């Protein structure tokens, strides 16, 4: 009965929507286009910070990285502000999650090293976590604007929901590094009108958004019931039909989240 | 099926739940124990105010009313403070909507004249909105204490929703008088943890709570979707098994309002 | 010289304003009517929680205190919702500060015991702290409506600033108990349009507010420079000449609060 | 008095501070080093846009301007992504106000035509507004690195302040184009930590920042007191001496904006 509401919304917004909420115990797993590929956009920055955390001792966050004006090829609300002072790996993590800093993402990719600017190294991480589907091919800003139907720079709601579940709810990171990943997502500044807006205020919400061309708008999140149960909520959308220049519609994602919330209550 | 949910919430919370959302042009009506009598408790204070308004000119609102300390018989956070100065009728209106002032409701009843200190004149008024079910027989605070089974001082979620919908959305009052009600109901102080706690914050909510013995908790409220679509939501509950001292479980009404929000999104 | 802006502010709000900011290491005190008595109103609730915290082990915060609907003689946003279940001392503390709950403060005074329904014990605690001017005589709601000119239930901005400094910034409490009072003040709901509104958001502001008749309106707070210097700011006002029904003007306090920030920076 | 506060802030942050608020009817103007030259930096992009606006018709905003990868020489997070799409003038206007787009600056200058790649055109327009002092001479990013003492590419707080007042507050643009300026300015991303960070949140703030070398940081802004009254605040600063790569200190600009808020409150 919930796959009809989602469908009514797809036509309401001239958009395509994908949803996956992994199953807990006392509740069943919500899915809708759950295995249809959607473009990562900036949502990849959450496991990207998880990857960098994984591969290094905490003392590595204090390492200072330096960059030029030419490294700024995308919206960078923080990296634009320290071109000559540079920033430590730790701030790049802060920026990449809390401000969706495109440049910070691109440096953290580099910290991972390897071919393809670190993208292949990153897709390695997801595989390690059990994710046999996602793939990262470009850096910012290209990874937002692959053509519709192109499998490059894509994930599924099913697969991204489970990478998130392991990172914050599971054991992919040791607790000290996990709390860093969590607190960042919790102090995010970019998802106030998405899954955050579809849930009551006494539900805690930590999230990481993603936005790109072709009307793409995503929001992956972990939410906490007012009694303290956690649920993982992956919502994803595009409007590829209306062209590269199609505005995204955040309301669709907030409205989705409200259908989902009434189910988890 | 949304009715399996309300029976879940009943089991999880050890209660009897009652839900009625009038059908709008764009949605079908919600029903769960819709035409079962629940106790009014303090929810009658909303139709009470619109009664004094309906019979009297706006100038009536300045009739200062005086009272003794023996007239204070229920929770009356406001009446208690003016027991030597008195309160105008329009204060007793503020008093009784926003603080659920028991005593002020008793005065407001007396102001409607008639036998049983105005309860006859009041049920009388309800019937002019087409409501032949509900009745008010007691005063404050006895109406809160009727045994289960007993039909005195009872309404139903169907009955109360439609009355409310006439008074806030409909022409049951002219605009000048109508905005005094909606304003008090909007700046109410007693309902933060009920219907309000279960709709996301981009929804506007105005409510009047009621609470009494045998676990009685209610909230009648008019909500507004983030795009301005008004709905009407009547939620009532009692736990007439757990005893006369059974505690009311607000979470139940809040968990139920989230179910409704799922359907209206 | 900051005495000129204040006196200008007295004139266009038709109010009388008291202001005190104790002198920190590098900066000189700010005073203006700093020793003219002003009514406590509800600001006394914060050192009252201090007094209860002081005389009892932490486990005393679990004592269940039980009250009746007769005990509700004043605005009590939380105490009015737990008349049947009762409330613990730590619940009362939370209400007394974060919601200025009136009934909550009365039971806490009763926990202090002693003559005067506890007003004696509270006034003595203040002496212990160094305060030889303030005095609590009545309970709530009487303490809000002593007539102008009446020393009863009055403190001074001077005296209240030095009490608040010792509780928050000194050793008048031990760390475990002190960090409880701060958090309650840091998480207040009544203070958003006063000293909080007059300080840039990058400053941290914890406060307790007071409001009574004759346009009385105070706010007592500790603030933190965005580099972390702490300052104490006692601001108190009334409009007692306008009469018992004079409205308080919150913007006077925000604006006085902005005058002071300009000087702490 | 305030004059002494700004030289305090100068001593502590190790800069020379420049401050000018035009006098309004109600206030007397603030001046600190007000007619001393500081470097435009990015703040010229405010009058730059209004120049395109003034001279061309609205349709001109839809002229697409194509550019090469060689034309990217400054921090250009928006121009970096459209090297194939090109950008309309309206877009290069957005980029240059809200993201301080270096490479969209130049393009708009080249739209002003004439000699020096439109630097001669630009001052030209400045003089048509009364401003006899400021000159623009280079482009991005040369104009950000002129040595101290050099008069090229410089303005003064008194200078820039009155042009900004003409543009946002005055009649240097017909209201239809007057709104596109202020709108872009209101939704600016590059200046959260400067003047905005020094005025309370019930003050509305619009601004165009500038940054460069020798610790140069500026912020020109139009602020609105909570009652509705508008002021113009020009805040500039450098730290020549401490070196060419001497890091700029946003804190200073935020500090000084809090003293301004002190006087105007």
Numbering used by the authors:
A (entry chain D), B (entry chain A), C (entry chain B), D (entry chain C): 29 to 293
Task: Provide passages from the article that reported this PDB entry.
Beta(β)-lactamases are bacterial enzymes that provide multi-drug resistance to β-lactam antibiotics. Mtb β-lactamase (BlaC) is a broad-spectrum Ambler class A3 β-lactamase capable of hydrolyzing all classes of β-lactam antibiotics used for the treatment of tuberculosis. Sulbactam (SUB), clavulanate and tazobactam, all β-lactam based suicide inhibitors, irreversibly bind to β-lactamases and block their activity. Here, we report in atomic detail (between 2.2 and 2.7 Å resolution) by room-temperature, time-resolved crystallography with millisecond time-resolution (with timepoints between 3 ms and 700 ms) how the Mycobacterium tuberculosis enzyme BlaC is inhibited by sulbactam (SUB).
At 3, 6, and 15 ms, the DED features near the active site of subunit A are weak. Substantial displacements of the residues flanking the active site are observed. Particularly, the long-side chain residues such as Gln112B and Arg173 (called guardian residues) move outward from the active site before relaxing back to their original positions. Next to these residues at 3 ms, almost 10 Å away from Ser70, there are positive densities that are spatially more spread out than that of water. An SUB molecule can be placed in the electron density. However, refinement of the SUB is difficult. Nevertheless, contrary to expectations based on the size of the SUB, no electron density is present at the earliest time points. This can be explained by the smaller second-order binding coefficient, kncov (1.5 mM−1 s−1 for SUB compared to 3.2 mM−1 s−1 for CEF), which prevents the accumulation of electron density at earlier times.
